[PDB]
Symmetry: D2
Subunit: 465 residues, 4 copies
């Protein structure tokens, strides 16, 4: 059931309706690669939901109340006040993905100096690390381990909180590695495993108990803190009558600091946060704020403009609107349910995205011929929809052999920019897939005509086989 | 078929989802009168589409480029340039409903001085006068006549252009009254007859031929000039492949000047226009521009702020977007069709609004007990929808007898703010009526508890019988 | 002493610097009439300060938080709340000059029905009526009388409150006319007499005492309520340590309602207010709100857009900023003092404007040759400054004889848009006059080449003699 | 001579006027450190001109026309089009300081692979490297050399282009180091040497000739490209009648690519650019665009919001406005001249900033007691001005000895945010220094009460001695 919008549309960005012939020529010009298509030629852009969503009236208005002072800005104060009242965290560092490149080395050095952490043995844990989070950890020489539950990636097996930490696994992992060697634990909410799955407050409390016992810093990766709070309100009986705000205040008692991209639930096109709960982490705050300036090995300055901090200060609240969250989540579920109904199969589908199995949809196309990229092109031809391939095309070649890397599955990712498209667009997408599935046998595979040495998915050009 | 939005939502105004109990208390506090309800307590506000619609990104941005100079403003120039390029009219007077209070007395005096028009015999014609247009005409001592076609108000009899002028009637009326006594003819597009019906270009050309033959000024009442152009493109074969812009340029060759509220098709919350095609009406321009200043009997100044003129300068173009018009019109038709399907009957329904027959829907309620007002309250209770009664409640009492005035039908008006609500909201409205029709027998009539002497519909309070 | 700006400039409107040759050609193209010059060709536009000033960040931001609902708008509520907290008035009617055309007929009818007011004998009083206020009064058949003090127009005789009511005169006038025949008294603050002069709170209390004794409605014409409050704080010892807000709350206890153009002290480009203090004037509120709809003799709708009401709701407060008022007033006084220093003489100069005596500055030019218009053109040629003539040119011809009307003095008006120009611009203006005074003897008189029958000053074209 | 503003102020940010007692308490609360003062408590904030200036109406409006698409954004296209038409560069990479961290390693590797550049011998040249530019170069293991002219830092010796490259020195340096070992040459305009000094087009052409001869990449560090163009128009006879735009197009023929922070001349609060002229540097473009994504050692995404790119697309043009540049530069020169007149001495003063010698102004205060920080506090106490110390306080302690580092001079930096303050503020600053110089002997030195281990200037607290 797609819920009606708990809002009145106030500002729109016109998008032209193209003809089939126009799109056919467009996709050829772009070398059968949606990444090379002009935004204006895309009717429904499902490339990413990162900073591509709508803002509320108050959020937009906030952009015109900025204090551009380098220091002591009232706009910075407003943002810090929002964090304090919403998460209960006293220290705020605005960022322009939550400054993972900052807190990671800071936490590693902290434990090395205080508990004799061994850099050659250190391991960080999370219910599920985001790619960049794992990236910065490993770059800093830290091994990572995802301690997710058995039900996490098990489709066809409904579970209210598939993003939960595997409490036993975490405990066993810490003991195995040695508490002095665990620089931090990252609690990702909602979790990025299986398309996006929530984490229960009960699970978070249990995880924090474990972390506290071993005195291990806990960082809440909060890009989708609001949707997680909504899932808790909807599925965790204990919090059924709690407001999203109360659930959020409670949730954050179970972390020592937070790091988040504001480009998701916070509703803004740019910005992030790195915050610390209380004085116990004041030194961590200082170190991070310091490293923020000299991260390059010398002083470098810059930051969000005043208006952007004022906008986020408002966005943090609007992002928690109960009616909004119920609507956003219901729309995503509406799309998935609609696709499942017409026979479209997804390897995984959650709050973050739906990963359609193009291999199953287009079985006649060899993996090396990129069936998911072929599907992306067909979806554009038929409906002007742009989606990203998550398969052999994206995977690329082995840097040491120059040969195509082996890929588990050929998926096509569908993300939904917040408060941007309607139920009618969702039905349009479903009808598009229905048409593709019907004409599947006739979709051709692809082969390169131009291929970069690295990050080929962004600018490579292909032709039909 | 509800078309998908030819745009991405960019800015939203949050609206809270209320409980049935909350609305029940709300409607009682407002004395069973939606006019007294707080806007925040209304989920779907169908009160009016006048200046309540969304704006495009470019239109909003324009508000920040204003030149506030009293005279010679580049913002005024930009607006005049838009009028010249869109309608082909060389003279523009921005207004803050198209200054009917200005051109009417000006045109009357013009013909009185030039052709000996007799004020005691003068009569003005239109395919259908808007209420305020008829109001200003009559206040100026001018009688009005609507020369609409037979098919105009005939439901159950599809006709492509029900707003057409009755060419024979117009001709006969002019001859009857005497050409020297006809100060002007107003071509309303789209026409306000039967809920809003289009006027064909063929019909407009024919009407202008008649007017020109008798040298009678023709004023194009243009609040919905774009939707009319769209209907011409959709239904008048000759213009099937013409752009909305070309149809508009052609359409305006068949009027000498134009008057319009910009609060409809032009997409803005305020403003209007009074324009003249060429030098042949330069003296009419001068007189109007002059009367604009001394309309009160002495000089009075003021006008749209610069940003507002820049916004309208853009709005005139965005309002003609083909995809937008097709979408707007399809949504309105979608609502009407959906209501017809569930057994809801409308006395008239067109592009402007749908007039539900509350008397037929709630036959047990006596007219004097306001069945349409009762229906308005029930619609709010059940779905938080606000609609206006067009019946005995609005009609009021006879100023000379203090008795209720007799009313032809008890109607409930449904209007749709542009680019504000979605197909999901439309379905919500339809489901609401479905529920009401199902529980019709139990809806009670109303009686006053407080009643003003004039304009009672705005602040009167009632209770159930 | 020009005070430094109590603010940081945040948004600017570029204005091109023209050459002398360019302006020489420009003024000729405009027929030696600044009113016909393009705004872009004017470097410093002193035409009017009405709605031509800057806005604060919060005021601008407010424009994006509008609730466009026809009724029950939260934006209307916000504006009404501002009025209640600032003036203490419970009833608010937003207008789009304070709806003088509304309260005047309403107050006249009120006293006619309640106290037997005789329309053939009625007379309204004010410390000084604004032109439009006097206009609407007289149009309604009501005679007006300005009861200003002796020192009001006496230059060379400093007096702290030259805008004061002549308390004795008011008393004597009421008795003479008969209290039943005085429909209302208008307290104009600041007063428009002698270029703008303040009214003391002591004087207002005394006037209200008189009005209350006779039960005569008192309307506060409040376009410049804030500057008056500032003058009271600066010159009335009793209120030296009172805030502008406290002075305003106190001031408004001495009126029954208020009417104001928001285009002055309220800092906005459009809008006004008509408000009533308490229930004692609830019927006056109802009548006005009612007449607002049917003022034309039938229902007509429209109003400020939501954003505009939100903006004014903020503007009413920002307009009272103490540092801002001190700065605005000091700048005006700085210009006048600077002109006086170089030998330029003004017939009158106050907070509203400075009226330079062009006749004295250019004694060789006959009045019929418009020395003030000649001066306006010269000021533009030399510095790109645009100012309005208040003399024989503006006065026009006698409608009954077609002959030039006799004029007391040939003045050139200088107004200063709020927060728009700097001390450097003020010095630029002073230097311009210094240059003109130096080359006075060579400035030529003007004669028509094109002259409209009415309101000739706006579009007439002239040439040098 | 302070020029009048070539613009009308449209939006202001109110700033409160504080009392001496208030500021005295404020500076004590902030531990005698302006960096710890609330922005609201600072009347005139001269901390930095980086992203603290005003924007034009069109620039602000642009923020509401953003296309947030991840790729193919029309907003990105608009920005790239501006770069192409203004600089003639075909390739644009928007950045969120011009991505020095990107082009430096890219250019180093390019020459290492193509000409056998030796990383242990590489040296980069510039007329004067900005601190961060030198920082990234050295971090990449590249030694830097500033080849400025003899007259560069020689005060009391006027020279039109003190930012010029020492052509002979550059030639000799390249030969000495070996052309294969010079990865790039950076042309900084205007140059950051001696407070900001321009570079002539003749000098740039000569430098490019040298670079081209040796096939060495030339990067134009363009934060202040417009002011440099203005100085060329004002001082280089050959370009006297050329427009700023023509001078800019010509100037950029003498570089292969450009890198710039848009937070200066480009008038925006955030953003930068890294651009390449033509196909000869297409591979450099690709490499940079690629490294932009994987700079962290793995893919990371993000970028300027659509509105920000639209704003910069406009800002690049508005920043070149001739009247604006003349005004901006004249104001800076007005401040310096005014200070020189009252006996205040600056070690260096140019277009970027003025460096007051606090040691000379307060000779009784020992360097270790921070006379420039003492001066900063006194300036705040007396006038509410905030300025940054560039002396022993900023220099800090030797990381290897913990002892105060030796400092050449105790300077206080004065920067001027663009289009933010007026001539009256400039006079206010001058009067403030006049007062300080008069009460110099009584100003006390400072000593720590709290001192961080690193970057102490930002949060250290001190007390008077
Ligand atoms: Cl706001
Ligand atoms: Cl714009
Ligand atoms: Mg900034
Ligand atoms: Mg205006
Ligand atoms: Mg409205
Ligand atoms: Mg983005």
């Amino acid at each position: 059931k797609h819920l009606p919008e708990p809002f009145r549309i106030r500002v729109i960005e016109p998008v032209k309706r193209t003809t089939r012939a126009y799109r056919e020529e467009a996709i050829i010009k772009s070398g059968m690669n949606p990444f090379l298509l002009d935004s204006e030629d895309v009717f429904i852009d499902l490339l990413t939901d990162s900073g591509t969503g709508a803002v509320t009236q108050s959020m937009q208005a906030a952009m015109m109340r900025g204090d551009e002072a380098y220091s002591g800005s009232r706009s910075y104060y407003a943002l810090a006040e929002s964090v304090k009242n919403i998460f209960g965290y006293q220290y705020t560092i605005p960022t322009h993905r939550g400054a993972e490149q900052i807190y990671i080395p800071v936490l590693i050095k902290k434990r090395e100096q205080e508990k004799g952490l061994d850099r050659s043995k250190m391991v960080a844990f999370s219910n599920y690390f985001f790619d960049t989070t794992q990236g910065h950890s490993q770059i800093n020489g830290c091994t990572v381990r995802n301690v997710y539950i058995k039900e996490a990636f098990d489709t066809g097996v409904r579970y209210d909180f598939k993003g939960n930490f595997d409490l036993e696994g975490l405990e066993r992992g810490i003991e195995e590695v040695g508490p002095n060697n665990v620089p931090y634990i990252v609690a990702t909410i909602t979790s990025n495993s299986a398309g996006g799955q929530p984490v229960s407050l009960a699970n978070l409390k249990a995880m924090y108990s474990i972390a506290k016992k071993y005195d291990i810093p806990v960082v809440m990766d909060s890009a989708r803190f609001a949707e997680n709070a909504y899932f808790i309100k909807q599925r965790e009986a204990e919090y059924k009558d709690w407001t999203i705000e109360q659930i959020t205040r409670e949730t954050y008692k179970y972390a020592d600091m937070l790091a988040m991209s504001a480009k998701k639930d916070a509703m803004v096109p740019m910005g992030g946060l790195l915050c610390m709960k209380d004085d116990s982490f004041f030194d961590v705050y200082t170190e991070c704020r310091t490293l923020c300036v000299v991260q390059e090995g010398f002083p470098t300055y810059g930051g969000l403009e005043g208006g952007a901090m004022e906008r986020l200060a408002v966005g943090l609240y609007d992002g928690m609107n109960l009616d909004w969250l119920a609507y956003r989540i219901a729309q995503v579920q509406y799309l998935v349910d609609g696709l499942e109904e017409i026979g479209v199969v997804c390897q995984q589908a959650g709050g973050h995205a739906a990963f359609v199995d193009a291999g199953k949809l287009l079985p006649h196309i060899p993996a090396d011929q990129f069936p998911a990229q072929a599907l992306a092109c067909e979806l554009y031809k038929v409906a002007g929809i742009r989606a990203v391939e998550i398969g052999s095309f994206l995977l690329g070649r082995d840097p040491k052999t120059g040969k195509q890397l082996p890929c588990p599955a050929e998926l096509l990712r569908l993300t939904i920019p917040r408060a941007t498209y309607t139920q009618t667009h969702m039905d349009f997408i479903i009808e598009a897939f229905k048409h593709v599935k019907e004409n599947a046998a006739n979709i051709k595979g692809l082969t390169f005509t131009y291929e970069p040495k690295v990050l080929r998915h962004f600018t490579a050009k292909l032709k039909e086989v």
